Amino acid sequence: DFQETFKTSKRAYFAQIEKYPKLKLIDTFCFFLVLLGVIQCTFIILIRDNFPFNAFLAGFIICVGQFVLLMSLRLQLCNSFPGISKNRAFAEFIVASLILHFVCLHFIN
Amino acid sequence: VDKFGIKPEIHHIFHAEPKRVAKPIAVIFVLIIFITILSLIVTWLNSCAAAFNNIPT
Ligand SMILES: CC(=O)N[C@H]1[C@H](O[C@H]2[C@H](O)[C@@H](NC(C)=O)[C@@H](OP(=O)(O)OP(=O)(O)OCC[C@H](C)CC/C=C(/C)CC/C=C(/C)CCC=C(C)C)O[C@@H]2CO)O[C@H](CO)[C@@H](O[C@@H]2O[C@H](CO[C@H]3O[C@H](CO)[C@@H](O)[C@H](O[C@H]4O[C@H](CO)[C@@H](O)[C@H](O)[C@@H]4O)[C@@H]3O)[C@@H](O)[C@H](O[C@H]3O[C@H](CO)[C@@H](O)[C@H](O)[C@@H]3O[C@H]3O[C@H](CO)[C@@H](O)[C@H](O)[C@@H]3O[C@H]3O[C@H](CO)[C@@H](O)[C@H](O[C@H]4O[C@H](CO)[C@@H](O)[C@H](O[C@H]5O[C@H](CO)[C@@H](O)[C@H](O)[C@H]5O[C@H]5O[C@H](CO)[C@@H](O)[C@H](O)[C@H]5O)[C@H]4O)[C@@H]3O)[C@@H]2O)[C@@H]1O
Numbered sequence: 172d173f174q175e176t177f178k179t180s181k182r183a184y185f186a187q188i189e190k191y192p193k194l195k196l197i198d199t200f201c202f203f204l205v206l207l208g209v210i211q212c213t214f215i216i217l218i219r220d221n222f223p224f225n226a227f228l229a230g231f232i233i234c235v236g237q238f239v240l241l242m243s244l245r246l247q248l249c250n251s252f253p254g255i256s257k258n259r260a261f262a263e264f265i266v267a268s269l270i271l272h273f274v275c276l277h278f279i280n
Numbered sequence: 281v282d283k284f285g286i287k288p289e290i291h292h293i294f295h296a297e298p299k300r301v302a303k304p305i306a307v308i309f310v311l312i313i314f315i316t317i318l319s320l321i322v323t324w325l326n327s328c329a330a331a332f333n334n335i336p337t
Pocket residue numbers: 221222223224225226279280298
């Protein structure tokens with residue numbers, strides 16, 4: 172059952188990431204964006220304190236936000252939406268990313 | 281005997297400044313994050329292929 176769908180999906184996935192090179196860049200980025208969030212959470216646990224809560228959140232949310240924007244890009248890039256082309260779906264991504272980076276550099280103070 | 285004698289002194293009691301972690305631990309974690317960024321930047325250029333083929337001309 173599950174142990175079979177596992178190989179099936181792994182096959183499909185690696186096939187796609189090899190066929191299209193760019194769909195690996197985003198994936199690598201997303202993987203590391205997880206790690207950084209985990210590192211921050213581990214810090215919060217290792218010290219059992221979250222004194223700069225503004226700072227902690229500004230550092231965790233920039234990762235969550237970048238992850239979700241990358242996934243929106245990967246979905247708009249694997250199968251384009253009706254009125255948005257691959258280009259416009261990269262410029263929109265850039266604008267949203269820049270806005271996120273600003274509000275996050277304003278939150279940490 | 282109200283308000284006829286010297287009065288006991290009052291002194292405000294303040295709170296405590298929140299404890300900041302010792303700089304060694306913070307330095308260790310900063311190093312971990314820097315190593316993670318480097319590992320990403322090299323995973324792109326090594327295991328993954330960021331081809332840099334189509335540089336505009
Ligand atoms: C009746 C009523 O209502 N009332 C109200 C009012 O109202 C009113 C209004 O106002 C008016 N207006 C005008 C203009 O005039 C009017 O109106 P109107 O007409 O109505 O109009 P509107 O409103 O607009 O309309 C509305 C609309 C509607 C809503 C519509 C709807 C619709 C619909 C459709 C529906 C929708 C929905 C839904 C759901 C549905 C949907 C769908 C579905 C679901 C399906 O009129 C009205 C009426 O008439 O108002 C007011 C106001 O204004 C209010 O009041 C307020 O309140 C609040 C609250 O309260 C609450 O809570 C509390 C607690 O908190 C409690 O206590 C309370 O209790 C109370 O009450 C109860 C009952 O009554 C009783 O029983 C008791 O006993 C008591 O009494 C409650 O519960 C409060 O709070 C307030 O207070 C405040 O304020 C004041 C001023 O003066 C003061 O005095 C006090 O003290 C307080 O304070 C506080 O707060 C503030 C803010 O808020 C501040 O400023 C201050 O400072 C303070 O704070 C402090 O403390 C606190 C605690 O205590 C804390 O938390 C804080 O902290 C924080 O913050 C800070 C600053 O910002 C910071 O700093 C911090 O942070 C730090 O730390 C931390 C920890 O450690 C850490 O983590 C961090 O990191 C840090 O950071 C820092 O540092 C760093 C470095 O290191 C740096 O970097 C940074 O930067 C910094 O930051 C934090 O934490 C502090 O401590 C008041 O009371 C009333 O109520």
